[PDB]
Amino acid sequence: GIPHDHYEPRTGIEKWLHSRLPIVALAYDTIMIPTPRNLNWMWIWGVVLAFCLVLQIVTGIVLAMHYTPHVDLAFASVEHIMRNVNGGFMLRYLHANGASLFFIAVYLHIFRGLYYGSYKAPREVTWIVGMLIYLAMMATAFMGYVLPWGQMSFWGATVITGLFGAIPGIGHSIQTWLLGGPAVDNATLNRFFSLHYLLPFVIAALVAIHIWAFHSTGNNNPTGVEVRRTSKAEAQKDTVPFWPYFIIKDVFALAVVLLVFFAIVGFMPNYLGHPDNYIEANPLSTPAHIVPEWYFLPFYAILRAFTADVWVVQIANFISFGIIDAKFFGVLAMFGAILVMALVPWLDTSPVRSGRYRPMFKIYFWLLAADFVILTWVGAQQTTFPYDWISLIASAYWFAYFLVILPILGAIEKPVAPPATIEEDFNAH
Amino acid sequence: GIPHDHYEPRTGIEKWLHSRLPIVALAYDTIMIPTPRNLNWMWIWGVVLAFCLVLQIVTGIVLAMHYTPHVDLAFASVEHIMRNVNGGFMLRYLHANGASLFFIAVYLHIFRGLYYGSYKAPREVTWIVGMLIYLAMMATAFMGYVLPWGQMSFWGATVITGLFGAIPGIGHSIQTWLLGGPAVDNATLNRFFSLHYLLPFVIAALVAIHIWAFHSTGNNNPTGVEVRRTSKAEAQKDTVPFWPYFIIKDVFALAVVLLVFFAIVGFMPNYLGHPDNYIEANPLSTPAHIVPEWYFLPFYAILRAFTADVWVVQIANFISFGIIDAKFFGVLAMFGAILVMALVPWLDTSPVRSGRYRPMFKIYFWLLAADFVILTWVGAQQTTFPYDWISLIASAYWFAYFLVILPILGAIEKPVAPPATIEEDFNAH
Amino acid sequence: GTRRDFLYYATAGAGAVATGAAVWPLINQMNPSADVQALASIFVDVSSVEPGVQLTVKFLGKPIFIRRRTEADIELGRSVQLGQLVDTNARNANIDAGAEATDQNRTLDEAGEWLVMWGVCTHLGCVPIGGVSGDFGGWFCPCHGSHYDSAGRIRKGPAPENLPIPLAKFIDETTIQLG
Amino acid sequence: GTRRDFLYYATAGAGAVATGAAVWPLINQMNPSADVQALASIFVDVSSVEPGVQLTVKFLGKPIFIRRRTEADIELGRSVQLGQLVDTNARNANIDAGAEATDQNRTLDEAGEWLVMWGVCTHLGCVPIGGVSGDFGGWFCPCHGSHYDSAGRIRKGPAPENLPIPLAKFIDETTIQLG
Amino acid sequence: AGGGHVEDVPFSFEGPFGTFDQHQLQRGLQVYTEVCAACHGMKFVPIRSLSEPGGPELPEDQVRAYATQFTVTDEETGEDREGKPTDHFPHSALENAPDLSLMAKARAGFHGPMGTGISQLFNGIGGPEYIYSVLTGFPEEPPKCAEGHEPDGFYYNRAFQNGSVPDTCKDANGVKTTAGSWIAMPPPLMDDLVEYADGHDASVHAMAEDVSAFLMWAAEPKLMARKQAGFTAVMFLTVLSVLLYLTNKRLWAGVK
Amino acid sequence: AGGGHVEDVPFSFEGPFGTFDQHQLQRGLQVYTEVCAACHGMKFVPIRSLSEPGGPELPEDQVRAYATQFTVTDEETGEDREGKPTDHFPHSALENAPDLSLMAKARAGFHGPMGTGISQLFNGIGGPEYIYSVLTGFPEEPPKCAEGHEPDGFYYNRAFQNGSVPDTCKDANGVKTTAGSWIAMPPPLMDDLVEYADGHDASVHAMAEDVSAFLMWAAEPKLMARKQAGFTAVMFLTVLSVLLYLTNKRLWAGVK
Ligand code: HEC
Ligand code: HEC
Ligand code: HEM
Ligand code: HEM
């Protein structure tokens, strides 16, 4: 809790309500929390994500009023929306590209957290809550891609049940449980649709905890120096209230984001998608040029980088007496990329919060930013030479950054002195 | 705020969490709030509602993994669940009778509030919040009844669009908008399914405000005497903590409720249902003996009680120069039964809270309980004589109780002295 | 200052228009699509409909009743006077909206033998039971208890109007053209 | 006192067992239903399959490959030694599970002309591309890049095992019995 | 229409411990195939369930042989073929003949004293007991009010209620005076119309009871699992209720 | 397979202000009816859209007359009947002929330099430009490497990529030497095979361009509405952005 000032009922109606349900007080204390006044444009992505989550749910609920979860009608029901429902063509492209906007946001939102050390204490809860949001989003966003029931949709669904099917021993049981039969069939589409509706509400529930988490501790800032809490007047020099200073700033950036985003949806709605999903599902034929969505490609590369001849894989195979094969190792590597990223509060031992004043950390971060982009780029490329080795170096550096580099970094760091106060950084600039 | 005692982090882990997100403190203050110690068996129905809402949502999500919102496959997809899905027969009957359990709960929950004056101040917010929940529940349960797409499902859907179709001028437009065409078709079934999925989450959100409402003010009690807040030790004499005394007592009653409920679902799952919903939808023929769900019958009776030859209707018809016809008047009466019940804090002018110490109020209240049952029973009966007038006498008393009797009662009441404190009542018992 | 307060209104107005311009697409989607808007007329073969037999046909999602009325059904309509009727409008798309609700204005032929009308109760859209049912030897609605006479006019119940009559006409001796 | 603390354990266990007995039905529902469980065998007419042409047939939701191999494909298979193969198991339901992954153990006839196998990549269930593709003159999987030889054996890529061979046998000269 | 009287049948499946008679459903299956199948169908009943537990429980080979007599239009190919156990029974061969899959649960056989649901509370819905009354409710001659006035193609049945009735049989204020009404189904059961495997009695009353049980199983195949599971859930919550009471009783002992 | 080169066509619908040429879609409609419909079908395209705005925009009578030539199996009755404007185009008459409804959006005509999507970002997906290349990409004779080695029943096309190739045309390490591959579609366009209403040129390149435009409209009928709404939202949010800029700019003056 940062030193704010309580809410005082002014009118009579406010007194009537405040003595029964202090909803106006909770809104005031929340929306007027002191926020550092030095936040740059990288602190907008939280509000954009909030809008996006409303956008997907609002448009998504509308799409459920015309979609039919059945293999014989699913692909057809989408073209019904596109052609006959008034404005239905815009709503699908909005819901489709909206997911892409919803996913460029999180990565910029996440890389902001990684750069400025917003995962280090006391903000572990905000990070872990965020990671749960990320996992729900990835599973949620995929199952939406299953619903159109195109060629890309059908064989993607076959993969995910195989990913849980790759676990030793219990995998085959789980794969049948996920599929509802020997293969992807009507039982699989019907259940994936139910979860695609459910999980966004679970995501909304997490966002409430996500919102509560940073309000209790306070927003991080580019310098990494915490707000002064010794007096109300000292905090006002380092901070301004969230409303109206930063709400309008985030809303301003939102209009610019929406300005760019609506031009995408209005003029190239299919550039961010794959044309193969406009072909009806064929259980007897897989496309030659599979490419998942751009927000799944970095995890697509990790799944393919660890083939059976990789040196690291062969070591694990003998130690486990053959249990950990290339298939299971690839699944562990893919989910392992989350685990190393989820555990980053306990791998970075440097006591300096902001990475602006960590010179050695900056290099590995920007390499990681390049690494994540490079990982995305190879996902569209064929597995042949030289792309096979490139994805392994990129995959290796990912685990090296979190499991090897960041623990080592905390000891040998030579940090730079941060400013004495947020006001010094704000006023000097 | 009642004088409780703060939450003190005990273990080490609790200290680590409490300095970042005080969820354990909010949980402790919430679950340890001081509750009056004189509650009888009628204070269980609030907890029973919580289980039912979870039960419908949990079972509902499962049913959505096999249902197909399409007229050609909906009814068929239900019989697929009944016959082929493992354990599907139990889950559907749970979701069906569970809604019936969910609706005997609210009425017992509501009639509890009416007797003990839990609608009078400072509990207006809790009551009005409850009314919004009731509307969502009523709307939700109907749209779920449309989904099986039987004979009752089809013509029920035709009626509700007619109710919004009964508004003068704009009604016919709204009826098309709700229907998505000239008549009930696939557009209506598909959207009713989407909203039937949405509103339970909206209901859950309202329940949070409903729960928050009574925690700020405090639970009502049979005597109506407020808790002493002059010291923590005086409150301890009038109150006990919510956990474990009333959690176990309500959980005990819940098990007894579930015991009764599972015996229904286990041995007569169709006694509370109507056989006509096991017949495929026929747009060209309506059944002769329509009977809505028992939790819709009392509002079904009000809709039919005001035919075109009622004297009161003719008065409104002439005054409005024919605008207020029998159709529009009947809809207003049906919706009006909610409005008069919602506005009861501003219609009951008696300063005595509890009806236990109001002798004349007791007579009129128990008539209303009989009135609600009579209204429920006549809804299933044929429209011929004498059922037409009985439902009209019963309908008349409903509005008389709220709009006429309760305002009049506050003047001529001869109340009895309540106890000085909650402790006095407990010691006699 | 016109440069000052204007900005604190145009920004709010743009947001208001943004909310409105973002809500209107979400509402209009529920309206009927092109597949339903483009429905058309039908032709019914009434060659084997004896007097007293009712023929129910779907049209624009709703049922249309086609009853060849018997000797008795014709008279009951013609015996009722315009003052005895709840609704004095014929509710017929063929003749003008102001036409009176006479039995000869509810049927297609001057003999009043063929009665063609929407099978849509004007209360809330249920299908009245056919044949000779109710308290007026006509149609009875089981949803809420509306009674119609043998001419298809409302006599008792919540329903305000008579059953509407679609645009119908005999194109030849043995075929009816609905719509 | 065994009468005292014991009650505060059995009461939780009964609630826990009740929760568990109520949660297990919610999980088991996702398992396959009866309509899919009761699939059965099929018969394929290979009368007009010349050498080099592959015939794909649906069976239990997945594709089964039926390729009449060419002159070059057969010897290419027989040239590979058991030590050169990633997987030495034939993965064949007809012969025993321990059989070696020789080219003569992957076909139905001693001539090795007819190759019948599941068109289900053992990595994650995609359909490998047929004809003569990959780095071993066989099948290439486009999902993650698995290369098979002309006999349908895995040689390179994430896939652990060879493509499984269903229970198949020739019932007559020109008909195959799958399953 | 209306709701009248019925012949109360002690069906084996009735009661908390009731269970299907495996042999009885085989007879009802025989009655359906040989008589009822000519006009009616069961579009919702999978043929495979004739060997599933809690039913007729035939050998899978007999079901396989039984299923072959039905013709089925393949969903994919389009050409007709023999019926498999995976397919459902065919649609109703007669257009205006309702489907019998859920008939045993779609009709109420009992009606509360004054519409209070007390009779259903003690006797059940009465679906299988209503079917027995329709089959056995065809009299030799019509009621005296209808003698010489039957609509051609319709037949009087005591238990049927949703049928038309001649005006000559109604009372002064529009209410019908006959117990039943006129149904469009000719009497399908004739004495000894079916010859059973084990030489069991083939009277009209016997066939109606047997096919009614088969029609109850067709409408509710999982009845035997429901009552075992229901009884099971009752036992657990009963134990949970008792323990929660004793905990609640001792917990509240330290206040009053 | 792979992703190769294509003939860049300046289609009218390309560009932020691009719009369909109404006469061209009528020409492309004629090409589809007279040539492509013999083997292909459009199971997703409603016939009524030939009068909807942003399309061929024919009179409803011509659409009514045009629709009658197609045979349709009535969903309810079962017997075939004349085609109405409410019916869709028929399924593909030729089994292995893919449906042309979404072909103009299901194929990519351009490929990023190194799979970076830079070419698609500036040129589009390239579907309608890829169809033009397949129709006009049938050469007179095959490549010299295939002379006497063509797979029987296939034809060489420069732009098709998923086709077979003779082993005599592959290099030492398995890579094909030909630009294109052998497609199973015979050359559908022959010079002046169609005579247009407005007397427009009916060359192979012209018919491919005209039918491509119609094939693009079939895949995206609401393209012209989408760009109108898109420009509006861009213009509106620009106004909102501008006002929010000045508002945000003046608000922070009272801090620093
Ligand atoms: C044709 C010769 C039939 C045979 C053989 C059987 N039924 Fe039938 N049935 C037939 C028709 C034309 C109708 C419609 C009746 C109507 O009034 O529209 C029926 C109806 C039924 C019903 C429904 C009763 C109700 O409450 O509506 C039942 C329960 C029924 N039939 C049962 C039944 C049984 C058990 C049969 C075999 C012993 C049987 N029917 C044979 C026509 C024919
Ligand atoms: C039969 C005589 C045909 C006529 C007339 C037309 N097409 Fe065709 N087409 C035909 C077949 C058998 C196939 C399958 C090809 C294969 O290799 O499997 C096709 C395919 C196409 C395609 C798909 C190309 C691809 O990338 O896979 C297209 C785009 C196509 N056909 C277009 C097309 C047009 C525009 C036609 C009328 C001018 C036309 N086809 C006619 C068979 C026949
Ligand atoms: C629906 C998704 C999300 C929404 C709406 C959201 C919203 C927000 C908001 C409003 C803030 C306050 C500061 C800001 O606006 O940047 C914030 C901060 C933050 N978020 Fe998120 N977020 C989401 C997902 C995530 C995820 C998935 C992660 C990490 C895996 C994450 C990590 C963080 C971090 C580290 C902070 C900084 C906290 C602080 O400075 O105290 N967020 N988020
Ligand atoms: C909140 C996060 C959500 C994300 C990231 C998301 C993402 C997606 C994606 C990527 C698709 C595929 C689009 C395409 O292939 O064209 C999709 C489809 C779909 N989604 Fe969602 N979705 C979300 C929430 C919801 C919700 C709450 C609903 C509620 C009903 C919903 C309903 C649908 C439907 C019906 C489809 C199929 C129709 C279509 O593709 O346009 N979605 N979603």
Ligand code: HEM
């Ligand atoms: C999902 C539906 C509902 C749930 C889960 C619920 C739950 C609860 C709970 C837990 C309480 C605290 C005391 C108690 O348990 O009785 C309560 C109190 C109350 N509820 Fe509800 N309720 C629901 C619906 C309603 C409705 C529909 C109304 C009225 C129209 C209503 C009126 C009240 C009142 C008057 C109180 C007493 C508040 C106080 O004493 O401060 N509730 N409810």
Ligand code: HEM
């Ligand atoms: C307040 C919460 C809810 C109530 C009161 C409710 C009530 C009902 C009712 C009365 C029916 C008709 C049952 C029948 O006619 O047999 C029904 C059907 C249905 N409901 Fe709900 N429901 C609720 C929440 C949900 C949720 C959250 C879902 C999905 C996630 C859902 C999914 C369904 C489905 C799929 C059906 C049709 C299948 C069936 O009838 O068994 N419901 N519901």
Ligand SMILES: CCCCCCCCO[C@@H]1O[C@H](CO)[C@@H](O)[C@H](O)[C@H]1O
């Ligand atoms: C209030 C709780 C009552 C529990 C349900 C009563 C069950 C007795 O009721 C009987 O159950 C039998 C067994 O299922 C059914 O065969 C009968 O139809 C039903 O009437």
Ligand SMILES: CCCCCCCCO[C@@H]1O[C@H](CO)[C@@H](O)[C@H](O)[C@H]1O
């Ligand atoms: C970053 C925001 C960019 C807005 C989208 C760019 C739109 C210009 O892009 C062009 O749009 C045309 C309109 O359909 C398409 O035909 C072209 O293929 C596409 O390249």
Ligand code: FES
């Ligand atoms: S719906 Fe017909 S009278 Fe009410």
Ligand code: FES
């Ligand atoms: S799915 Fe075949 S190699 Fe991965």
Ligand SMILES: [Sr+2]
């Ligand atoms: Sr090696």
Ligand SMILES: [Sr+2]
């Ligand atoms: Sr009067």
Ligand SMILES: [Sr+2]
């Ligand atoms: Sr009985």
Ligand SMILES: [Sr+2]
């Ligand atoms: Sr171009």
